[PDB]
Write a protein that holds these residues in place. Structure first.
Motif, PDB file in Angstrom:
ATOM      1  N   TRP A   1      43.247  33.979  37.091  1.00  0.00           N
ATOM      2  CA  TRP A   1      42.699  34.063  36.071  1.00  0.00           C
ATOM      3  C   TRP A   1      42.728  35.699  35.938  1.00  0.00           C
ATOM      4  N   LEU A   2      42.936  36.373  34.875  1.00  0.00           N
ATOM      5  CA  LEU A   2      42.768  38.089  34.653  1.00  0.00           C
ATOM      6  C   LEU A   2      41.287  38.053  34.397  1.00  0.00           C
ATOM      7  N   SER A   3      40.993  39.002  35.034  1.00  0.00           N
ATOM      8  CA  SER A   3      39.602  39.688  35.008  1.00  0.00           C
ATOM      9  C   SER A   3      39.200  40.547  33.771  1.00  0.00           C
ATOM     10  N   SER A   4      38.028  40.948  33.539  1.00  0.00           N
ATOM     11  CA  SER A   4      37.801  41.735  32.272  1.00  0.00           C
ATOM     12  C   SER A   4      38.371  43.119  32.495  1.00  0.00           C
ATOM     13  N   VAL A   5      38.370  43.836  33.775  1.00  0.00           N
ATOM     14  CA  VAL A   5      38.866  44.811  33.898  1.00  0.00           C
ATOM     15  C   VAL A   5      40.295  44.836  34.167  1.00  0.00           C
TER      16      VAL A   5
END
Lengths: 32, 109, 289
Positions: free
Chosen positions: C100-104
């Protein structure tokens, strides 16, 4: 001139790792 | 602790502390420091309170009604029990007598 | 009204699949990086011909670590060979957590959306995968705007959708509010399959070589003894075993760890083996002289 440039690229990768923060540790002993 | 600025300093199960924001719900006034509070897990912000020191200790300590023992059902050491009443009971029921003497009420036994 | 906005069926070549695996595994624990090279045609077709792993960066997945000096340079070499392909996204590993894609990383993937409008972020998780199949998923930016303006239904048309239930809370919130997941298919030619499939002729040359023959006796001997010890418990088991109620019987006459089953299993192993052993021994002898 040619040889010096090759040093300049190697130095930049070293630069990325050295960038703060980094784990601080202590060396229990060097086996060597 | 609460810092008036919509931030708080909280401890969770996990070991490091957090400079967190209060986000809506419970007002700063309606909070008491030392209370157990509700955090949202993804971003730790005070989303409310309902817990109020949910803990077995709280359970044991609280007793709002008066005890099962009524007075001098217990037989003998009458005088002894009528010493504990002079110090404890008497100032709560009437501080008037103590004021009039010019002496602080006794506290503690 | 609106565009189809059907996320690409991401046809990730066998070559790209093997190649993410190598870079990602060796590079543990440091979260690796690189670009995916391919081609986008139609509305929902991206073929990822090849990928290349950018030099490690100590900063980790960052906006720092994406870098155009490397980008330019590799592509300029591929010009010479005619194997040149445009940047159609980027891959990286999170090996320390699931796909899953991080906030960064949502900020970063947005930069790539300017470059290429069908840009993917494909998270490959290498330590936690035990086969290089499970816990690998593909993603593509869904704007903040979409979430507000109730444009998510437009986004999931002509798709079956893929939910990853595992990993929730936060992580899941971010995932749902950032990207859209779609199935990942592996395409290969049958010339490739034949290569994958291939072995050698020294494969069968070895299969005509014979062991020392005393060792073969050892195994035949051993099996007979092996089976004696388990034939007593089997012998005991069937002495009565008529008593009503099956569930009780399973504890009483030890029907768990079934001796009948275990006897047939050992007999059958040793048997298939000894048919190959007599056969091979005879074949070699008659063949040669």
């Amino acid at each position: 001139n040619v040889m010096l440039e090759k040093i300049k690229d190697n130095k930049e990768k070293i630069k990325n790792n050295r960038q703060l923060p980094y784990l601080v540790a202590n060396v229990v002993e060097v086996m060597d | 602790e609460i810092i008036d600025d919509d931030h708080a300093i909280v401890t969770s199960p996990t070991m490091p502390d957090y400079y967190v924001s209060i986000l809506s719900f419970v007002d700063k006034e309606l909070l008491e420091p030392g209370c157990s509070v509700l955090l949202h897990h993804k971003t730790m912000s005070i989303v409310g309170v309902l817990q109020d020191d949910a803990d077995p200790m709280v359970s044991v300590m609280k007793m709002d009604k008066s005890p099962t023992e009524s007075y001098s059902d217990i037989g003998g050491l009458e005088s002894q029990i009528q010493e504990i009443k002079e110090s404890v009971e008497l100032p709560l029921t009437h501080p008037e007598l103590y004021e009039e003497m010019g002496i602080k009420p006794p506290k503690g036994v | 009204t609106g565009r189809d906005d059907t996320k690409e069926t991401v046809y990730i070549s066998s070559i790209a699949l093997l190649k993410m695996l190598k870079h990602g595994r060796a590079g543990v624990p440091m979260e690796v990086m690189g670009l995916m090279l391919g081609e986008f045609v139609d509305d929902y077709t991206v073929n990822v011909v090849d990928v290349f792993a950018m030099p490690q960066s100590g900063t980790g997945v960052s906006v720092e670590a994406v870098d155009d000096v490397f980008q330019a340079k590799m592509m300029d070499m591929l010009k010479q060979t005619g194997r040149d392909q445009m940047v159609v996204g980027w891959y990286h590993s999170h090996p320390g957590f699931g796909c899953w894609l991080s906030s960064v990383d949502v900020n970063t993937q947005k930069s790539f959306e300017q470059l290429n409008s069908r840009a993917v972020a494909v998270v490959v998780d290498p330590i936690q995968s035990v086969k290089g199949k499970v816990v690998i998923d593909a993603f593509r930016l869904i704007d903040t705007g979409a979430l507000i303006n109730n444009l998510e239904p437009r986004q999931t048309t002509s798709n079956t959708g893929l939910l990853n239930k595992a990993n929730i809370q936060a992580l899941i919130h971010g995932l749902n509010r950032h990207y859209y997941s779609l199935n990942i298919d592996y395409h290969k030619t049958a010339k490739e399959t034949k290569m994958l499939m291939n072995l050698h002729k020294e494969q069968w040359q070895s299969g005509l070589k014979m062991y020392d023959y005393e060792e073969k006796e050892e195994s035949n001997l051993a099996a007979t003894k092996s089976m004696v010890k388990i034939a007593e418990q089997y012998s005991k088991r069937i002495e009565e075993e008529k008593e009503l109620t099956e569930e009780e019987l399973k504890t009483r006459y030890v029907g768990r760890q079934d001796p009948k089953k275990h006897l047939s299993e050992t007999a059958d192993e040793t048997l298939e083996n000894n048919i190959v052993s007599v056969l091979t021994a005879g074949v070699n002898s008659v063949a040669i002289k």
